[PDB]
Design an enzyme around this catalytic site. Structure first.
Site, PDB file in Angstrom:
ATOM      1  N   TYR A 345       0.913  -1.436   0.004  1.00 35.82           N
ATOM      2  CA  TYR A 345       0.138  -0.159   0.291  1.00 35.82           C
ATOM      3  C   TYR A 345       0.560   1.280  -0.240  1.00 35.82           C
ATOM      4  O   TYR A 345       2.108   1.611   0.476  1.00 35.82           O
ATOM      5  CB  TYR A 345      -0.789  -0.176   1.194  1.00 35.82           C
ATOM      6  CG  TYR A 345      -2.275   1.023   1.487  1.00 35.82           C
ATOM      7  CD1 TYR A 345      -3.372   0.536   0.876  1.00 35.82           C
ATOM      8  CD2 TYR A 345      -1.920   2.530   1.601  1.00 35.82           C
ATOM      9  CE1 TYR A 345      -4.291   1.764   0.764  1.00 35.82           C
ATOM     10  CE2 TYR A 345      -3.072   3.767   1.513  1.00 35.82           C
ATOM     11  CZ  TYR A 345      -4.100   2.990   0.870  1.00 35.82           C
ATOM     12  OH  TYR A 345      -5.058   3.884   0.919  1.00 35.82           O
ATOM     13  N   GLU A 379      -5.495   6.814   6.173  1.00 36.25           N
ATOM     14  CA  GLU A 379      -5.580   5.898   5.100  1.00 36.25           C
ATOM     15  C   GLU A 379      -3.986   4.531   5.765  1.00 36.25           C
ATOM     16  O   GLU A 379      -4.765   3.097   5.557  1.00 36.25           O
ATOM     17  CB  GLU A 379      -5.444   5.504   3.979  1.00 36.25           C
ATOM     18  CG  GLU A 379      -3.699   7.004   3.630  1.00 36.25           C
ATOM     19  CD  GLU A 379      -3.203   7.050   2.133  1.00 36.25           C
ATOM     20  OE1 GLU A 379      -3.558   8.314   2.074  1.00 36.25           O
ATOM     21  OE2 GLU A 379      -4.114   6.263   0.926  1.00 36.25           O
ATOM     22  N   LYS A 440      -1.122  -1.691 -14.385  1.00 40.04           N
ATOM     23  CA  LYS A 440      -2.066  -1.164 -13.437  1.00 40.04           C
ATOM     24  C   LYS A 440      -3.194  -1.271 -12.925  1.00 40.04           C
ATOM     25  O   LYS A 440      -3.913  -0.601 -14.048  1.00 40.04           O
ATOM     26  CB  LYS A 440      -1.055  -0.079 -12.796  1.00 40.04           C
ATOM     27  CG  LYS A 440      -1.944   0.298 -11.302  1.00 40.04           C
ATOM     28  CD  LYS A 440      -1.446   1.732 -10.818  1.00 40.04           C
ATOM     29  CE  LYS A 440      -2.120   1.588  -9.222  1.00 40.04           C
ATOM     30  NZ  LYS A 440      -3.459   1.401  -8.943  1.00 40.04           N
TER      31      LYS A 440
HETATM   32  N1  LIG Z   1      -7.742  -7.740  -3.504  1.00 34.43           N
HETATM   33  C1  LIG Z   1      -6.525  -7.984  -2.585  1.00 34.43           C
HETATM   34  N2  LIG Z   1      -6.403  -8.948  -1.913  1.00 34.43           N
HETATM   35  C2  LIG Z   1      -4.911  -9.349  -1.141  1.00 34.43           C
HETATM   36  N3  LIG Z   1      -4.083  -8.690  -1.080  1.00 34.43           N
HETATM   37  C3  LIG Z   1      -4.914  -6.597  -1.368  1.00 34.43           C
HETATM   38  C4  LIG Z   1      -6.175  -6.365  -2.136  1.00 34.43           C
HETATM   39  N4  LIG Z   1      -6.408  -5.543  -2.544  1.00 34.43           N
HETATM   40  C5  LIG Z   1      -5.709  -4.678  -1.837  1.00 34.43           C
HETATM   41  N5  LIG Z   1      -4.425  -5.101  -1.464  1.00 34.43           N
HETATM   42  C6  LIG Z   1      -3.027  -5.115  -1.101  1.00 34.43           C
HETATM   43  O1  LIG Z   1      -3.523  -3.125  -0.404  1.00 34.43           O
HETATM   44  C7  LIG Z   1      -2.910  -2.555  -1.433  1.00 34.43           C
HETATM   45  C8  LIG Z   1      -3.063  -1.287  -1.890  1.00 34.43           C
HETATM   46  O2  LIG Z   1      -2.937  -0.894  -3.058  1.00 34.43           O
HETATM   47  P1  LIG Z   1      -3.930  -1.359  -4.882  1.00 34.43           P
HETATM   48  O3  LIG Z   1      -2.553  -0.236  -4.987  1.00 34.43           O
HETATM   49  O4  LIG Z   1      -4.812  -1.364  -4.818  1.00 34.43           O
HETATM   50  C9  LIG Z   1      -2.988  -2.940  -5.020  1.00 34.43           C
HETATM   51  P2  LIG Z   1      -1.591  -3.621  -5.425  1.00 34.43           P
HETATM   52  O5  LIG Z   1      -1.540  -4.690  -4.950  1.00 34.43           O
HETATM   53  O6  LIG Z   1      -0.450  -1.794  -4.725  1.00 34.43           O
HETATM   54  O7  LIG Z   1      -0.707  -3.090  -7.295  1.00 34.43           O
HETATM   55  P3  LIG Z   1      -1.070  -1.763  -8.166  1.00 34.43           P
HETATM   56  O8  LIG Z   1      -1.012  -0.842  -7.448  1.00 34.43           O
HETATM   57  O9  LIG Z   1       0.665  -1.818  -8.581  1.00 34.43           O
HETATM   58  O10 LIG Z   1      -2.131  -2.054  -9.254  1.00 34.43           O
HETATM   59  C10 LIG Z   1      -1.943  -3.388  -2.020  1.00 34.43           C
HETATM   60  O11 LIG Z   1      -0.393  -2.989  -2.580  1.00 34.43           O
HETATM   61  C11 LIG Z   1      -1.984  -4.753  -1.572  1.00 34.43           C
HETATM   62  O12 LIG Z   1      -0.753  -5.601  -0.109  1.00 34.43           O
HETATM   63  N1  LIG Z   2      -3.747   9.711  -0.375  1.00 33.12           N
HETATM   64  C1  LIG Z   2      -3.505   9.269  -1.935  1.00 33.12           C
HETATM   65  N2  LIG Z   2      -3.621  10.459  -2.569  1.00 33.12           N
HETATM   66  N3  LIG Z   2      -4.084   8.328  -2.616  1.00 33.12           N
HETATM   67  C2  LIG Z   2      -4.513   7.353  -1.794  1.00 33.12           C
HETATM   68  C3  LIG Z   2      -4.349   5.980  -2.513  1.00 33.12           C
HETATM   69  C4  LIG Z   2      -4.284   4.318  -2.433  1.00 33.12           C
HETATM   70  C5  LIG Z   2      -2.928   4.238  -3.471  1.00 33.12           C
HETATM   71  N4  LIG Z   2      -4.240   2.102  -4.144  1.00 33.12           N
HETATM   72  C6  LIG Z   2      -4.824   2.884  -5.029  1.00 33.12           C
HETATM   73  C7  LIG Z   2      -4.299   2.768  -6.606  1.00 33.12           C
HETATM   74  C8  LIG Z   2      -5.279   4.843  -6.662  1.00 33.12           C
HETATM   75  O1  LIG Z   2      -6.346   5.039  -7.296  1.00 33.12           O
HETATM   76  O2  LIG Z   2      -4.018   5.859  -7.083  1.00 33.12           O
HETATM   77  C9  LIG Z   2      -2.127   3.791  -2.993  1.00 33.12           C
HETATM   78  O3  LIG Z   2      -0.886   4.171  -3.058  1.00 33.12           O
HETATM   79  O4  LIG Z   2      -1.615   1.874  -2.400  1.00 33.12           O
HETATM   80 MG   LIG Z   3      -0.962  -0.259  -5.498  1.00 37.53          MG
END
Ligand SMILES: Nc1ncnc2c1ncn2[C@@H]1O[C@H](COP(=O)(O)CP(=O)(O)OP(=O)(O)O)[C@@H](O)[C@H]1O
Ligand SMILES: N=C(N)NCCC[C@H](NCCC(=O)O)C(=O)O
Ligand SMILES: [Mg+2]
Ligand SMILES: [N]C(=[N])[N][C][C][C][C]([N][C][C]C(=O)O1[C]([C]2O[C](N3[C]=NC4=C3N=[C]N=C4[N])[C]([O])[C]2[O])O1P([O])(=O)[C]P([O])(=O)OP([O])([O])=O)C([O])=O
Ligand SMILES: [Mg+2]
Lengths: 500, 490
Positions: A345, A379, A440
């Site tokens: 995250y 967050e 992404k």
């Molecule tokens: N369905 C799901 N299953 C497991 N972990 C999840 C998840 N949705 C979110 N997460 C966790 O929450 C974080 C929030 O992230 P997101 O940005 O929405 C996807 P991401 O895994 O970071 O890849 P991406 O941003 O390159 O697409 C992730 O790094 C992940 O560890």
């Molecule tokens: N604080 C913010 N401005 N944004 C937080 C968003 C959280 C973001 N995951 C979702 C992907 C996206 O649409 O940006 C992350 O950095 O994991």
């Molecule tokens: Mg992400």
């Protein structure tokens, strides 16, 4: 052999001139009050922590038998570096003591040196210090008035009292929906004079505004090195961590680093009855040979997390609440022992993970704005996972990783037509090719948006409708003292729609 | 070229409607192709340089014109992020190429000693370097934007709405100083402006073992100095007996293979002996200049006129430096100073206890903007160009970030800098610790303490209203009477 979870997840502390309030937390754990040897002149505190593990390491006291006590929720990551700047000793045992020893050498400037995930309160005589980590990743709230300072890791614990005696403070923002409750800024230390109730706040970190060009090859290796270090610092020796895994590069990158650090790894992915990235994640699972678990939850269950997410994060931003619904559901669905969880995250923020064009100006504009507005969104609060007893930590927002990613020129964040390119390149030798260069991730609505649309809410009024729903869930759970379980989410949404 | 293409300027952009600077040099008005709807400007520069490289034009996005005073140091880095291969002619063109790729964010990437104004269509950009080392002022009204590297040229004029994120120049009206490390994005038509900060002092501190900290500091200073020394040309270093200027001297000597130095003294004190030790260790061409205390005070109106500062403490620091630049004989020089090292390193800290060191450091870093203590005009008023290595963006970021224990260590002040130069300077120099004529002047005119620091602020403010606000040359100001009036006024 070493404690896997922080000594304490949160607290409700009090410093008063005279007097003498059972804390109500979303965070799950035992509630233990610390000793008060100086009576009314000591710092009073109730710590919420992992059951069966005494919270001793979350409390530190003077070595001269004087009225100085420090309480710390969370943990510190650059321990070796901090230990290297301390005099004879004794060798601090626990992060609260480390903080106290540092305060002896640098006073409040000690916090400018700490890279961690914590919230802390210190009382020395009639002086009270409140401090957050660089990103305020562990929310800290306070109620200050002449003669009394109350501080807590959850605003709800301060609002639980009848009309909190909290008044305006330098740099501290008033919490919307509550009275008398203020939030301590991220990357800051408030120096409070207990008697007057006045405070001076010092910022101990701020997002860099400049950008530094580094030789390409060097920049990429630097990102990998920083990520590897940040992850290693977050993994307990002797304990295999859990990484919440998605199909994306963010979580995949953390998993690769965590597996290297622990020698083995556990991974978990969540999906709904509508969509999932199970296949994408399996590619990384097989590549790393992790112990994986897939969790599927109906969309009705995911949306049922609405009051829990608001209650835990104490946030009223609908966009944020949406990102948290999936995670809130995942943490509550986990089975077995309390886990130390690492996520990917936050990577998108300094890297502009949302940018979708080769043109770079808008990427920097959005990034700079995001880094100037993340504080208060809560967050990445630990409560999101600790409400279920699990500890979470986020490597991408480690102070060293964050500074580096923020500083890179935009051409490294968006390149070769790919987003977060520098991170994809940094991990290209540790993950399968498909994971490394898969975009992404067009007309698809979020389930929260879908929920309101299914209620017949005009699509141009949906976002504001979501803002009002969250606002009301906050008033019931954080401001009203109602448990998420007691909230009729359907009624709330139906009500907002009927007024839209 | 040994000197920047331009020292300063007075520019404007309006609809269709010369300046007098403290800076010494030639004046050249740039061409105005777009006529009344282009960027008009008068550049002040050294008679020995062509102002060409200080101006760049293009049609990318819209008819565009850029004017830049000063120079850029991380040129190779900036060139590395640009496309194709047609290398820019000068720094003004380099900026234009960067703007095409990052727009206003281009400035977040620049490590230099510059002030620049750009007009692209009906949009005007005003930008300073990270430290605002080259002052930039502006008057903004709907349909009219005037910009200058000297407030005095803008004070000499009628209109100019208030600019929120900028500071009003003392006494002047409608005139604002562009903040350090910023870029002001102005819409010419509406006269509305939006300011973006492109740099800010770090607030966090870094922990490093002695060896690595010492090595990094040395490497950063060597690089910042190398960037400030023109290939082939032997630079001049204003040298005192202290570690700061001595450290710069050692680095400049290494980079140029030769070095010219100059030290100034008064009839009250000097550090000729201290500097001599370094002069011989590096074997430089040295010169000692001694100026009478009487002549040192006579600089009061020149320092105010040149720095355009109203801060008495800063004005006092600048009196000797001002006297020195004006006393230099020979051709115009590229001069390097060790000025500013005490700020990020807490040079004035005298205790082993560290808390107060960081308190003063954070305060100093949050309040340097507007003091203009490193303005080039202090030396260009005499034809010489100055640049300050210690306030190089990279060196500055590094020194500021170091934990207090690396600044006050082993009982020595500015420890890491001394250790960093240990193998390039004589032991006595690196080991000698860091350790008022103006006051004496007022006490002679009658004034008690608690009334002297204050009276000094009134004297400095009076000289400013005369030389900067009234466009009156310093040579026409009786510093004797200014003291008189202010004296019998408290
Ligand atoms: N369905 C799901 N299953 C497991 N972990 C999840 C998840 N949705 C979110 N997460 C966790 O929450 C974080 C929030 O992230 P997101 O940005 O929405 C996807 P991401 O895994 O970071 O890849 P991406 O941003 O390159 O697409 C992730 O790094 C992940 O560890
Ligand atoms: N604080 C913010 N401005 N944004 C937080 C968003 C959280 C973001 N995951 C979702 C992907 C996206 O649409 O940006 C992350 O950095 O994991
Ligand atoms: Mg992400
Ligand atoms: N901002 C704030 N806060 N503050 C500011 C202050 C400033 C400081 N300093 C002080 C003053 C001065 O002056 O200083 C400088 C420089 O310059 C030069 N010089 C001087 N003097 C002289 C010279 N040259 C020659 N001669 C004579 N006489 C030099 O270059 C220098 O560098 O400085 P200083 O400091 O004084 C001395 P040094 O050299 O540096 O040494 P030490 O070590 O002793 O210090 C700052 O800067 O910061
Ligand atoms: Mg000095």
């Amino acid at each position: 052999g070493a404690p896997v979870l922080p000594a304490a997840f949160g607290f409700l502390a009090s410093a008063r001139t005279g007097g003498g309030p059972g804390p109500v937390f979303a965070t799950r754990g035992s509630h233990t009050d610390i000793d008060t040897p100086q009576g009314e002149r000591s710092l009073a505190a109730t710590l919420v922590h992992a059951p069966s593990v005494a919270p001793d390491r979350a409390v530190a006291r003077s070595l001269t038998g004087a009225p100085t006590t420090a309480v710390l929720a969370g943990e510190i990551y650059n321990r070796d570096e901090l230990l290297s700047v301390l005099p004879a000793g004794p060798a601090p045992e626990g992060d609260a003591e480390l903080v106290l020893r540092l305060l002896e050498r640098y006073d409040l400037h000690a916090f400018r040196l700490v890279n961690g995930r914590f919230a802390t309160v210190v009382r020395t005589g009639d002086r009270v210090l409140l401090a957050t980590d660089h990103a305020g990743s562990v929310p800290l709230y306070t109620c200050v008035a002449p003669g009394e300072v109350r501080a807590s890791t959850e605003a709800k614990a301060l609002a639980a009292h009848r009309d909190p005696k909290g008044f305006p403070l330098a740099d501290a923002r008033r919490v919307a929906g509550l009275t008398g409750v203020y939030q301590v800024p991220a990357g800051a230390v408030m120096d409070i004079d207990l008697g007057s109730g006045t405070a001076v706040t010092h910022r101990t970190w701020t997002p860099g505004l400049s950008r530094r060009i580094l030789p390409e090859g060097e920049a990429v290796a630097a990102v990998r090195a920083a990520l590897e270090k940040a992850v290693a610092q977050r993994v307990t020796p002797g304990d295999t961590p859990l990484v919440v895994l998605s199909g994306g590069i963010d979580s995949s990158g953390v998993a690769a680093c965590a597996h290297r650090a622990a020698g083995e790894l556990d991974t978990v992915s969540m999906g709904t009855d509508t969509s999932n990235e199970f296949r994408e994640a399996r590619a990384v699972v097989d590549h790393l040979r992790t112990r994986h678990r897939e969790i599927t939850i109906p969309t009705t269950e995911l949306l049922a997390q609405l009051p829990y997410a608001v209650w835990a994060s104490e946030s009223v931003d609908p966009d944020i609440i949406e990102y948290l619904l999936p995670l809130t559901a995942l943490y509550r669905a986990l089975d077995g022992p309390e886990r130390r969880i690492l996520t990917g995250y936050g990577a998108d923020i300094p890297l502009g993970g949302m940018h979708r064009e080769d043109r770079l100006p808008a990427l920097d504009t959005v990034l700079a704005h995001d880094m100037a507005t993340f504080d208060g969104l809560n967050e990445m609060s630990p409560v999101l996972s600790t409400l279920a007893g699990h500890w979470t930590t986020h490597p991408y927002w480690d102070r060293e990783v964050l500074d580096l990613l923020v500083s890179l020129e935009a051409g490294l964040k968006r390149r070769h037509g790919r987003d977060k390119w520098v991170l994809r390149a940094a991990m290209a030798d540790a993950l399968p090719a498909e994971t490394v260069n898969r975009p992404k991730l067009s007309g698809t609505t979020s389930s929260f948006s879908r929920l309101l649309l299914d209620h017949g809410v005009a699509e141009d009024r949906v976002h504001e409708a979501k803002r009002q729903v969250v606002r009301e869930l906050f008033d019931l759970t954080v401001g009203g003292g109602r448990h998420p379980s007691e909230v009729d989410t359907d009624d709330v949404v139906r009500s907002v729609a009927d007024r839209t």
